[PDB]
Design a protein around this ligand. Structure first.
Ligand SMILES: [K+]
Ligand SMILES: [K+]
Ligand SMILES: [K+]
Ligand SMILES: [K+]
Ligand SMILES: [K+]
Ligand SMILES: [K+]
Ligand SMILES: [K+]
Ligand SMILES: [Mg+2]
Ligand SMILES: [Mg+2]
Ligand SMILES: [Mg+2]
Ligand SMILES: [Mg+2]
Ligand SMILES: [Mg+2]
Ligand SMILES: [Mg+2]
Ligand SMILES: [Mg+2]
Ligand SMILES: [Mg+2]
Ligand SMILES: [Mg+2]
Ligand SMILES: [Mg+2]
Ligand SMILES: [Mg+2]
Ligand SMILES: [Mg+2]
Ligand SMILES: [Mg+2]
Ligand SMILES: [Mg+2]
Ligand SMILES: [Mg+2]
Ligand SMILES: [Mg+2]
Ligand SMILES: [Mg+2]
Ligand SMILES: [Mg+2]
Ligand SMILES: [Mg+2]
Ligand SMILES: [Mg+2]
Ligand SMILES: [Mg+2]
Ligand SMILES: [Mg+2]
Ligand SMILES: [Mg+2]
Ligand SMILES: [Mg+2]
Ligand SMILES: [Mg+2]
Ligand SMILES: [Mg+2]
Ligand SMILES: [Mg+2]
Ligand SMILES: [Mg+2]
Ligand SMILES: [Mg+2]
Ligand SMILES: [Mg+2]
Ligand SMILES: [Mg+2]
Ligand SMILES: [Mg+2]
Ligand SMILES: [Mg+2]
Ligand SMILES: [Mg+2]
Ligand SMILES: [Mg+2]
Ligand SMILES: [Mg+2]
Ligand SMILES: [Mg+2]
Ligand SMILES: [Mg+2]
Ligand SMILES: [Mg+2]
Ligand SMILES: [Mg+2]
Ligand SMILES: [Mg+2]
Ligand SMILES: [Mg+2]
Ligand SMILES: [Mg+2]
Ligand SMILES: [Mg+2]
Ligand SMILES: [Mg+2]
Ligand SMILES: [Mg+2]
Ligand SMILES: [Mg+2]
Ligand SMILES: [Mg+2]
Ligand SMILES: [Mg+2]
Ligand SMILES: [Mg+2]
Ligand SMILES: [Mg+2]
Ligand SMILES: [Mg+2]
Ligand SMILES: [Mg+2]
Ligand SMILES: [Mg+2]
Ligand SMILES: [Mg+2]
Ligand SMILES: [Mg+2]
Ligand SMILES: [Mg+2]
Ligand SMILES: [Mg+2]
Ligand SMILES: [Mg+2]
Ligand SMILES: [Mg+2]
Ligand SMILES: [Mg+2]
Ligand SMILES: [Mg+2]
Ligand SMILES: [Mg+2]
Ligand SMILES: [Mg+2]
Ligand SMILES: [Mg+2]
Ligand SMILES: [Mg+2]
Ligand SMILES: [Mg+2]
Ligand SMILES: [Mg+2]
Ligand SMILES: [Zn+2]
Lengths: 235, 208, 138, 150
RNA sequence: CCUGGUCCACCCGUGACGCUGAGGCGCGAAAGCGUGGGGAGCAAACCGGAUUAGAUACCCGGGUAGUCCACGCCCUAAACGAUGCGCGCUAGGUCUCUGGGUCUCCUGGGGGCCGAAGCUAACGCGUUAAGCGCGCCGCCUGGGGAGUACGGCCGCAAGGC
RNA sequence: UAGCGCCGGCCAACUCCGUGCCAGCAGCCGCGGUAAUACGGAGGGCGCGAGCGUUACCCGGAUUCACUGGGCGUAAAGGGCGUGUAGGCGGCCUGGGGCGUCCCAUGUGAAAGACCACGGCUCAACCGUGGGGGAGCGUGGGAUACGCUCAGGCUAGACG
């Protein structure tokens, strides 16, 4: 909530190509063939976006975090592992929202296998199943790591790159789900309901935005939490 | 033509109990109280889903066979109603109800509409004093439909009007049983008729 | 050159609104400006203003759109759903007062050019004069 | 609470080594006759499953119709593909005059008097979709003045 | 050597002098015709050899008109982007030809690819429109009969419209 | 006095027997070669009814000559290309005229028919009376936004 001047490394967009003309309103200028985001409109939209986040958080709503860009996976896997908003980390499975019932059946199988590895029934039905179900539970935890928390459809989604995660955006639009996204120059701003015009490639931009967002979430429900242990993920 | 022949077979074919004999459609002898399936060898067989034309044709035939009016006069009355200003269906019903034979039936002078047709055709009914023997005669609001003084001694009229003692008449009709007469007070509204017909189906049938 | 300047302005407005532009520049003319007056008066546009491009005068039409919609295709509803030129060069359309069309049973407008100025269907009908059926808008 | 009527049912065939294999498709309209309609096209190896699936899809795709005394507020004209639907409001006592498909759709919507015309392609599916988009493109005077507030 | 079109920069001059275009007129690959010339290679027709059930073909050896030139005819075509011309409007990215410029790039003209909105029955089109508009011309109205018959015009003829 | 057509789908109405690509039916799709709801007969049913069918012709549906209201990349359809005649169409500003355009007043628009109301034959068909109409054209007066014309001006099209 105090990220006015601390925006170090967010204004750097993508190159001259691979952009989207609809983003021109959020662009300041072009330095050395690289689009640079307008600093003013960034906080201009941040006001409205963080205000919507605070409103939805103090109401007890759930926000799905979607990150697959390989530069925000390790960040989302813990910023959502904070206050219980679920997340999608490895890859976004087609139908996680429009076919939510079938994915919830997969989650039922996940907790079923977790219960079988808690009961003494691990030894019966010998080692063949003890390896098959082991690998099955392994991949179910790999893909449904954060998704297992969604009991019903979420009240909003948070995307790190709406171009890389366009399928999730489309599925949210189909179900009238508000779409919060950290957009860059390579994305269509019209599809995003609450835009955050920043950088999606750098690690510091994602860490800053998501840390401040989860901090605002916990602040909307009281009990301000310590600074997130995501700085060590700079490496 | 008048379709003259079996009638309760129409009570059966239309699927709705019609009253074409007057009595015996109320008694447990209508053959609709005991045989609700359509006539013929293939009456008890499982019915197929009727086409839209089938539905509209059946409804129009129901409404037409209720009054015993031929197709010619029926279509003529419908076109006349569609020419006029107002709802085509309610106006068509008001026209059909304004026929002299139907008024005689509604006034309880006859037990059935065909018996009323015979009573009219044989000059047993007067309109405003003058004898009228036309079932297709259109009764205007205010016309006094009476029984001929020379016919007031007939056994059938005595029976029918002796049974009308205590019976109520339609909201658009008045009845004097001692004088054996009545008055067409107004045109009947759709809410005044309890006919088992959807008028819009007939309008759509003739819309083709 | 332009064969029909008025139809050119109408098509500029159509093509602009179809991509949700902010404003569009049309080569300026008194007739076009008098039509734009009716447009802005009827609420199809936020208004117009005279401007100057490198050497020549133009008219900036500031377009109008509805609220951003939900679900797929969040693009807002168009304020000008339809705008079509009627009296074109090569087939000019003149109507009497008893021949003025009621556009969309009321919800639209028809712009006429009459001897008493450029009016709308209801305006001309109240004035009792007819003329050239410029265009229909709804 | 909700009336459901099927528009058409057809049997399609795909070729496989050995012969043709059949798949049934069905159109279904659902309406409360209060101003809400819904169109659905279901496909299934058998007919009843296709009808049920079309009903579900139709209930999932709803359209709010602004009726004005049993009729439409303003005439519409919609091209879906090569099919064209032309709608025009009518005074009471007129009745619904339309082909089978638009008649069913409009009757389930609660319309009582309207005039229609199918043009170009008479395809029942495309005519149904054009009728749906026509009902979706309807605007009330309130909506019109709402868009022109400024 | 003679000569046509075209593009850019300067913003210099005229001051609506514009667009299209039924007729008309002219140009119009190849093949074909006339007169004269030329004739290496190729090569219809044709002469043979093979193949084949036969082989009036494909394959092989020859070979004339022709292909070439001058002049005059002929008016056809998958004469194709199977998309008439002109003007305006409507995201961009990339490759390229050619100018101009503060020469990372910008700007203008042309040739390609991918794609916004939109269009299309779909394939696909998408600032080189098949999008949105306007003007003018040409043409279509089920298939066969048939681009045949008759008539007319043109042509030496083949034949064309 | 009750008859005539139909009963595979379009299209309302189904069974039995005979026949066996025969005899036949058929507006279009089509039916018949052993078990035909399609032929022929029967029973039954559907539709009209002093009529019912058939044929012919006209409009309709047919947005299938598309003014309203269509098209031409691959479905029928862009002329092989150009130059250009007539013709069609014509950027911005001011003024005159008022030809197109528009308005008012007025004349004309016979009757019958059509529409509406009342009335006369017991109803109706039929008929009478009254009412309302209406484009177009003539005349008088008026308007000038647009199109037209004339006079002038401008430079964004075009040309140099
Ligand atoms: K007697
Ligand atoms: K369309
Ligand atoms: K020679
Ligand atoms: K250069
Ligand atoms: K025989
Ligand atoms: K038979
Ligand atoms: K051609
Ligand atoms: Mg009526
Ligand atoms: Mg009427
Ligand atoms: Mg006139
Ligand atoms: Mg609505
Ligand atoms: Mg089309
Ligand atoms: Mg067609
Ligand atoms: Mg100059
Ligand atoms: Mg000068
Ligand atoms: Mg030219
Ligand atoms: Mg020419
Ligand atoms: Mg040639
Ligand atoms: Mg040659
Ligand atoms: Mg020669
Ligand atoms: Mg020679
Ligand atoms: Mg040789
Ligand atoms: Mg050889
Ligand atoms: Mg040989
Ligand atoms: Mg051989
Ligand atoms: Mg041999
Ligand atoms: Mg030689
Ligand atoms: Mg020779
Ligand atoms: Mg080619
Ligand atoms: Mg061509
Ligand atoms: Mg073709
Ligand atoms: Mg082109
Ligand atoms: Mg270019
Ligand atoms: Mg492409
Ligand atoms: Mg698209
Ligand atoms: Mg595609
Ligand atoms: Mg173009
Ligand atoms: Mg032909
Ligand atoms: Mg023919
Ligand atoms: Mg031919
Ligand atoms: Mg030829
Ligand atoms: Mg020839
Ligand atoms: Mg000849
Ligand atoms: Mg000759
Ligand atoms: Mg020859
Ligand atoms: Mg020959
Ligand atoms: Mg049937
Ligand atoms: Mg027969
Ligand atoms: Mg015939
Ligand atoms: Mg036998
Ligand atoms: Mg048999
Ligand atoms: Mg039979
Ligand atoms: Mg019989
Ligand atoms: Mg006859
Ligand atoms: Mg015909
Ligand atoms: Mg026609
Ligand atoms: Mg028509
Ligand atoms: Mg024809
Ligand atoms: Mg046309
Ligand atoms: Mg066509
Ligand atoms: Mg060409
Ligand atoms: Mg001229
Ligand atoms: Mg000229
Ligand atoms: Mg002008
Ligand atoms: Mg002129
Ligand atoms: Mg003037
Ligand atoms: Mg005048
Ligand atoms: Mg007259
Ligand atoms: Mg008439
Ligand atoms: Mg009378
Ligand atoms: Mg008059
Ligand atoms: Mg005058
Ligand atoms: Mg004046
Ligand atoms: Mg001048
Ligand atoms: Mg120059
Ligand atoms: Zn009975």
């Amino acid at each position: 909530t105090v990220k006015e001047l601390l925006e170090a490394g967010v204004h750097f967009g993508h190159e001259r190509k691979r952009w989207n003309p609809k983003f021109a309103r959020y662009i300041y200028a072009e330095r050395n063939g690289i689009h640079i985001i307008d600093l003013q409109k960034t906080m201009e939209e941040l006001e409205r976006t963080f205000r919507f986040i605070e409103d939805l958080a103090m109401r007890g709503g759930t926000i799905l975090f979607v990150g697959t860009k390989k530069q925000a996976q390790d960040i989302v896997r813990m910023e959502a592992e904070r206050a219980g908003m679920p997340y999608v980390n490895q890859r976004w499975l087609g139908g996680m929202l429009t076919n939510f019932k079938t994915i919830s059946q997969r989650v039922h199988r996940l907790e079923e296998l977790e219960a079988l590895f808690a009961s003494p029934e691990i030894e019966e039905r010998p080692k063949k199943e003890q390896v098959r179900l082991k690998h099955e539970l392994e991949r179910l935890q790999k893909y449904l790591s954060g998704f297992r928390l969604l009991k019903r459809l979420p009240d909003a989604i948070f995307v790190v790159d709406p171009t890389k995660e366009a399928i999730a955006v489309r599925e949210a639009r189909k179900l009238f789900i508000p779409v919060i996204a950290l957009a860059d120059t390579d994305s269509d701003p019209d599809l995003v309901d609450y835009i955050i015009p920043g950088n999606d490639d750098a690690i510091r931009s994602i860490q800053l935005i998501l840390s401040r967002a989860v901090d605002l979430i916990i602040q909307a429900r009281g009990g301000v939490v310590e600074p997130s242990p995501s700085y060590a993920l700079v490496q | 033509g008048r379709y003259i022949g079996p009638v309760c077979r129409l009570c059966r074919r239309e699927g709705v109990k019609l009253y074409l004999k007057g009595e015996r459609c109320y008694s447990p002898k209508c053959a609709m109280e005991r045989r609700p399936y359509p006539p013929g060898q293939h009456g008890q067989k499982r019915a197929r889903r009727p086409s839209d034309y089938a539905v509209r044709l059946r409804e129009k035939q129901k409404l037409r066979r209720i009054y015993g009016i031929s197709e010619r006069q029926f279509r003529n009355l419908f076109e006349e109603a569609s020419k006029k200003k107002g709802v085509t269906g309610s106006v068509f019903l008001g026209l059909l109800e304004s026929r002299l034979d139907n008024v005689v039936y509604r006034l309880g002078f006859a037990v059935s509409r065909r018996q009323a047709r015979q009573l009219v055709r044989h000059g047993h009914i007067t309109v405003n004093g003058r004898r009228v023997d036309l079932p297709s005669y259109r009764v205007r609001p205010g016309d006094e439909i009476a029984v001929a003084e020379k016919s007031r001694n007939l056994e059938l009229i005595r029976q029918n009007l002796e049974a009308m003692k205590g019976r109520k008449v339609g909201p658009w009709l008045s009845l004097d049983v001692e004088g054996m007469k009545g008055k067409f007070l107004r045109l009947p509204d759709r809410e005044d008729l309890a006919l088992p017909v959807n008028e819009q189906l007939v309008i759509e049938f003739y819309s083709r | 050159m332009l064969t029909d300047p008025i139809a050119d302005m109408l098509t500029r407005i159509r093509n602009a609104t179809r991509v949700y532009k902010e404003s569009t520049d049309v080569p300026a003319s008194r007739f076009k400006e008098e039509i734009l007056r009716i447009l802005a008066r009827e609420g199809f546009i936020k208004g117009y203003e005279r401007v100057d491009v490198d050497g020549k005068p133009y008219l900036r039409v500031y377009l109008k759109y509805g609220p951003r919609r939900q679900g797929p295709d969040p693009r807002p509803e168009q304020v000008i759903h339809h705008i079509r030129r009627i009296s074109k060069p090569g087939r000019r359309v003149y109507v009497g007062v008893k021949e003025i069309p009621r556009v969309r049973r009321g919800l639209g407008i028809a712009i006429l050019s009459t001897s008493k100025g450029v009016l709308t269907d209801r305006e001309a009908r109240k004035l009792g004069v007819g003329g050239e059926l410029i265009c229909e808008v709804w | 609470d909700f009336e459901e009527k099927m528009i058409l049912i057809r049997r399609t065939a795909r070729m496989q080594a050995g012969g043709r294999r059949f798949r049934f498709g069905a159109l279904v309209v659902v309406g409360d006759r209060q101003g809400r309609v819904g169109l659905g096209f279901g496909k299934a190896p058998e007919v009843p499953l296709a009808v049920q699936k079309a009903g579900y899809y139709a209930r999932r795709n709803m359209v709010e119709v602004p009726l004005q005394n049993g009729t439409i507020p303003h005439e519409i004209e919609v091209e879906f593909g090569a099919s064209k639907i032309v709608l025009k409001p009518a005074a009471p006592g007129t009745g619904v005059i339309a082909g089978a498909v638009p008649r069913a759709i409009l009757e389930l919507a609660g319309v009582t008097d309207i005039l229609t015309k199918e043009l170009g392609s008479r395809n029942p599916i495309n005519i149904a979709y054009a009728t749906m988009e026509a009902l979706r493109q309807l605007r009330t005077k309130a909506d019109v003045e709402r868009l022109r507030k400024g």
